[PDB]
Design a protein around this nucleic acid. Sequence first.
RNA 1: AAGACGGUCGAACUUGACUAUCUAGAGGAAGUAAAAGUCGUAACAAGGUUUCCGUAGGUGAACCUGCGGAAGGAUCAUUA
RNA 2: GUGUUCAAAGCAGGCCCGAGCCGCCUGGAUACCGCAGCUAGGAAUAAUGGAAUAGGACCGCGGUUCUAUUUUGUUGGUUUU
RNA 3: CCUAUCAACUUUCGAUGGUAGUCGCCGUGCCUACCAUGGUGACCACGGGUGACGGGGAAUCAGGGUUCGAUUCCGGAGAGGGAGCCUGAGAAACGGCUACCACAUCCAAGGAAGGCAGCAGGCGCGCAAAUUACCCACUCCCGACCCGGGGAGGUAGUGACG
Lengths: 77, 142, 263, 129, 158
Amino acid sequence: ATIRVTNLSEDTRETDLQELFRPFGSISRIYLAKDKTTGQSKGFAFISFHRREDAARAIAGVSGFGYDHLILNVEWA
Amino acid sequence: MGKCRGLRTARKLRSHRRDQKWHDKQYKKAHLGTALKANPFGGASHAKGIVLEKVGVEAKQPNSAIRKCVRVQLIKNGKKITAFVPNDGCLNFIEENDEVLVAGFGRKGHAVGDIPGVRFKVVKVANVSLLALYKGKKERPR
Amino acid sequence: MARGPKKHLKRVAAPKHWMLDKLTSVFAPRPSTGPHKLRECLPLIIFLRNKLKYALTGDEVKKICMQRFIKIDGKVRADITYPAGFMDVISIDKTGENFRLIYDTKGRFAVHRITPEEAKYKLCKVRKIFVGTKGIPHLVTHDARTIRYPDPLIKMNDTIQIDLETGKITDFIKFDTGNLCMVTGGANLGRIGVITNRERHPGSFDVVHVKDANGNSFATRLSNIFVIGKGNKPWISLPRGKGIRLTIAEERDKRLAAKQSSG
Amino acid sequence: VRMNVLADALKSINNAEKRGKRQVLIRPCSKVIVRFLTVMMKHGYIGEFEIIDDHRAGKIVVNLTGRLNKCGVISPRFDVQLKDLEKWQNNLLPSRQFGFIVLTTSAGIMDHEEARRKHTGGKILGFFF
Amino acid sequence: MADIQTERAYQKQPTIFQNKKRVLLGETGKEKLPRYYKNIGLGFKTPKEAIEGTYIDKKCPFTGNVSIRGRILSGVVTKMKMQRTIVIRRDYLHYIRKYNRFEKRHKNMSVHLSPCFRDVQIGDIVTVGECRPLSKTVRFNVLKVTKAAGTKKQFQKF
RNA sequence: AAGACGGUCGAACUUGACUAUCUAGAGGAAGUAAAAGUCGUAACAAGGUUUCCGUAGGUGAACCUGCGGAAGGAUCAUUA
RNA sequence: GUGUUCAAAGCAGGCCCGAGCCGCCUGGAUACCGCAGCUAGGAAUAAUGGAAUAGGACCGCGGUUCUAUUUUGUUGGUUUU
RNA sequence: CCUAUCAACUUUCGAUGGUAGUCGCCGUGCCUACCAUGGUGACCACGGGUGACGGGGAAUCAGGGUUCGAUUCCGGAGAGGGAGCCUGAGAAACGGCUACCACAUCCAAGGAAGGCAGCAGGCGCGCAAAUUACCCACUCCCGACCCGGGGAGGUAGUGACG
């Protein structure tokens, strides 16, 4: 499905997330909201998995898992 | 020696050999799939990852040197591994989030040299061959 | 799946004794449905353009057939992959040449010209002799020809001169010991010889001890023995390669001696 | 107690021969022992033997010679179809120029050279050279 | 033998039926209509029991419509429990070339036992023959129950 | 023809239960590596209390002790 | 077996005639089949066979009773064999 | 093939058998009445696992063995997942159908049409794998037919597997 990720840093880009979400199955694509007028990575991302099982697994784990000294928040989009 | 050898004892020999086969360390690790589960090689031969950070390692005695490794999270396997960076003054060209192709060392499944927790070596930096950079056949594109 | 029977057969999966190539063509001719089973058959095409070499395309083969210059068993065929078999006579009406198919003891189908006298009839062994409906008797030959009102003393494994001008039985030859036989299929392929003894076993599979002309003795199943006439009285000639049995050493001596000695 | 009788006899002779001793008492004595001894004797590997008769099971005194180097037993017996005979012969004999593998065939207890001519296989008893 | 009025339906054999003709009353057989018997060949003879019979079994190849074709096997009766079936244990050799001895193996097979065989017991050597599947497990039918030495009660004085 | 009676095959759905596989996690307690720091001196020569086994209890710790063993002890050897 | 220039391979080919010789001719062997099953020769080896308060052989024979069909033309009854 | 840190298992929604019937292209607990209480296991059943399709075959080994088999051929199986069906001798068919479920598409919002584990190609995935090409002339297949159609198949291109 599509899952939303929030509480991203501006030092956390698509590439940093790409390796992070591989133990929860292979991502199809990682879209990340950027605005270059203010900041870099706004704070919201949308990761798109190919399969429904893989997507749900991510939401469960990643929520409570630390990455760059912040608690990532993941939830169904 | 110490085995049965009658005229009907085929079954007993056949099963006894199978039962004892499992004891051996080299056999057991591979057949229980342990090798895949713990180490990222076994069920792959090469693997590409993204560079997490560049590490300096103040090598454990014997031998006094700074060994210098990179830490890589492999995309396919999803495991974090510290891998040696070979070649002279070649640490330099690695950059955080710049990838590398990692491969096993030579002991296979176990630590090499004077340094524990490293059993893998980098082969390409920037996916364009560390070897080619060291020789100066090819340039660093990144 | 598999929702029905194949209409194709690949080459390099076809029976060896048709003498096709290996992988240089990816499809074999495949016999049509007919009076004989596809293993033992010889599609018309293989005879016409691979042995007698009258075509170098498939386009020509179709065009040849449509001329209708070819009768097979006295009757006018036009099938491109006709399922001819054992002692089936091919009649070219444009040249007056009659060819019959009989095994070499090498195991290769023989190109065996016969006179139009011997192409009048063929000897067919009875497969079943049948009391049909409303108490009319019939004999059924191996090549699935049912002839009504047959001679009223015949019994199993008799041979029967079938005539191809007019159909029907044109006498018969009674099955007896010492009759000529050609043993077809197996490890005894294309050997000719008498009988000697037919051993009978109740229940399935009865073996027939054969002695060949050379004096080599062997058994095969009754199924693999085909009766081709009366003992020491051929009705068609021996084919090339003896048709009896020859050793690999003798065969080499013939191959080298005849070659570069003709022309 | 004794689950093979060949194995005891063969050892007994060899152990005597090592000493230089020219007598043994083998027992329980069987038909196969007699037959093995005669074939062995004929080729000159051992000397003559004498069977003493008792109602126990018999006892044989073999007068041996040191023309033998080893008489081995193939226990448990194996089938030999004349295309494992070749494999045995290269494996377990020092040359193909001498030594006999002795088998039991339906055409009698015989040396393997005779077996090869008959083309009758059977069960392998042992060997000597 | 056993009656066919034991169940709740009377049976007949093919083309054996009552003509009672002009004369009063039966048949009304005195053996429940003529008992038809036939051979099965392959070195077996129909016994007295077939002829004596009138039983509701029809899986018998001497009174039934079943045909015996194929393999003829032998086995030892490992179990007799309930009526009209027995279990035979069929010993066979499985050949091993890889080890230079080979191993016995067995299978137990449920097999129909006709009421054309009686005075039978466990331990009996029996000769069974192949048939079309009679019931889900049972492909075979007892053609002859042999008695046979190695079993004794053959040293007697009565 | 829609429709419709009753049945059979039966996808799917809903509510409880179950197991497997995977993953988050405050904290707790181990073993390993990890190295030249802190406190003892345990075993190694009878290591200055010979060692060690089973078992129970005790000692900050190595460890000690009772009870029965073993020698792989330091005894292959003690008597008219 | 065979002259793909060697070779990986392929199953081909080689001759005689000016091109009316309206042509001659060799081939694409043979070997292999987990097993089990089928056939058949052997009888060593390993198991296996029986007659004990008797049993097996040879129309050895009797008195008693039964049933099936040959036959006394045919068919029925009685009596045997 | 591996497993006992799987030792008892199979029927109340038949487990095995007898009898009789319904049903099926046809055998048969296939299904059902009635009636029996069976059937199977230490010779490993039962249960669990499995990048477990099977064979012909492949690689290395003195011999013995060990390892491999989706993959040019043969058999079976499936065509997004399930279930049902029509046509026809043969199909429970995705370049047929119908429903639902998971996916995707058009929409004027009422509706409507769909299945590349076909050939090319693209996306995703990864350490990993090619032309959106040309042709029915060959080799064969199909048809009412020599005549037509064929991503069967041939042909080139890509190609330091080797």
